[PDB]
Design a binder for this molecule. Structure first.
Ligand SMILES: Nc1cncc2c1CCCN2C(=O)Cc1cccc(Cl)c1
Ligand SMILES: Nc1cncc2c1CCCN2C(=O)Cc1cccc(Cl)c1
Lengths: 304, 304
């Protein structure tokens, strides 16, 4: 019983964190096998960030200009290349702590854990979601670049995010592990505005199912709705449209509780229209959208 | 920028998790040096839990009746003793992954990270607080007993909690690593009710300072108050009384923001009296009390 914003155990990722310095810029790198992955803006000075030509700036850098430190020991850089917005530094030593891993590009609405790091050292772990506007609401300070986002399936770490940038609004942008930014963001010190941060409806529904499983049931109403009727309401409240794909994914939660997906949509519709009236659900006074239906099943079943 | 409920990186604790089985009961153990610590109710059947005499039940158990498995390998139990509500199983092998560690008994209001485990395997990490009624609001399923709570200072893990029990209300109770329960709880299948779960005022104030640091400032008012006036309001809203010790601990946050502690108390007083009016602070529609002033300083400074 109880429901928490839970992150994956970070050990497997902690074993991969390294410090990468180029010139006077220091950030985090991810050491997997004999490659260290880091944001390409490690080669930039603050002045370079205004309008960087990364290919040009990289010509002035050789293998010995990239200082990679794993713990208190120096790794020897024997090759370097740029893949989109990430640098791949080939080192002469495979990371002995390399876990089984994959690189995945996630969809908006998907959740992951972040191991926030500074100087190659882990400071904390938290759970977040890729927003529908392709930003993340993280907790990152200067030096946090190169910290990564990931999910774990038994013994396999799927790396999905690498932190690159803070927007002028204090929200965060980054890339997958192939260096492609999520969303339209560019690694440049130029004002970039994020789009509408809509609520991830399927995740709110998953969290309403988690609340019923854990005993918070006051919000269950006597109504039902249709996908089209619900979506008219969802549109009005800047919620993402619900599709039959989302209904399908909520099926195991509907089966466990005996509450039809469309009945739960009608409960959500009434909560949107009437508010919480000073009440709480799972210790929250607002509708939580950073738990996927998979996260709810995982937490409520105890997958390790 | 950004503010998250952040847990400590769990790696150091993951390396200590083991599975302990006695008869047909299986739970988690914490392997540090050559000792495995686990809840004493590992020796109980479900029938025994109704009215257990642990000293009597333990007479029927020998070293070979405790099966300790670390990963997929079996540890040899060469001694066993009961210390309060925990069993200490001496094994013939020191844990090679034992981090630098201390056992601490925390005060109510203090926060810690929990590495929730099942069958000796970590499932997730989350941050919580020792409530003023000595319960924790965790996320624990059957098999989670023996999962631990901890804090980390650079390379030293301070273990503060070991999970033992779920109360009939779905809140959690457990012990320090010396086996002494927090609060008046007993390891028995008997209905035990928790006292008033008051709000940890000093933590709410720390989180209001975190909000100002991160740009959420709408709640700052033109008023000030006194400790006695504030505490009259705090009493009325089931908030813990604020003392000069709490004011002293908020000093670094007051210094960073230039907002006197008593001015922040007056802002909190108005929020209690007027509510949030549909607004949010740091993404929350309620006042958060699971961040200590130390946690806010740590997250806002990037301690690793
Ligand atoms: N607090 C914080 C969090 N996450 C990143 C950053 C900060 C503060 C300063 C460093 N930083 C950046 O965003 C630096 C940067 C500038 C322009 C483009 C890119 Cl790719 C990066
Ligand atoms: N869901 C859950 C979470 N945390 C613990 C437990 C559960 C469900 C069943 C196991 N369990 C217990 O509390 C078993 C127990 C009974 C009586 C006294 C003590 Cl010390 C322990």
């Amino acid at each position: 019983s109880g429901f928490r914003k839970m992150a994956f155990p970070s050990g497997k990722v902690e074993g991969c964190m390294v410090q990468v310095t180029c010139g006077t810029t220091t950030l985090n790198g991810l050491w997997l096998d004999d490659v260290v992955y880091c944001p390409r803006h490690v080669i930039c000075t603050s002045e370079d960030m205004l309008n960087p030509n990364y290919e040009d700036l990289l010509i002035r850098k050789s293998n010995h200009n990239f200082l990679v430190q794993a713990g208190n020991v120096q790794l020897r850089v024997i090759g370097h290349s740029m893949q989109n917005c990430v640098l791949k530094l080939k080192v002469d030593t495979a990371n002995p702590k390399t876990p089984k891993y994959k690189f995945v590009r996630i969809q908006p609405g998907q959740t992951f854990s972040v191991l926030a790091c500074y100087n190659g050292s882990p400071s904390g772990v938290y759970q977040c979601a890729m927003r529908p506007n392709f930003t993340i609401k993280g907790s990152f300070l200067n030096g946090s670049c190169g910290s990564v986002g990931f999910n774990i399936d038994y013994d396999c770490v799927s790396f999905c995010y690498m932190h690159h940038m803070e927007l002028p609004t204090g929200v965060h942008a980054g890339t997958d592990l192939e260096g492609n930014f999520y969303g339209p963001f560019v690694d440049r010190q130029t004002a970039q505005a994020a789009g509408t941060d809509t609520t991830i409806t399927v995740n709110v529904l998953a969290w309403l199912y988690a609340a019923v499983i854990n005993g918070d049931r006051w919000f269950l109403n006597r109504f039902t709705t249709t996908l089209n009727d619900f979506n008219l309401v969802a549109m009005k409240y800047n919620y993402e449209p619900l599709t039959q794909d989302h209904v399908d994914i909520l099926g195991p939660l509907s089966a466990q509780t005996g509450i039809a997906v469309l009945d739960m949509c009608a409960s959500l519709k009434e909560l949107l229209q009437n508010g919480m009236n000073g009440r709480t659900i799972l210790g929250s006074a607002l509708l939580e959208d950073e738990f996927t239906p998979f996260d709810v099943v995982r937490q409520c079943s105890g997958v390790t």
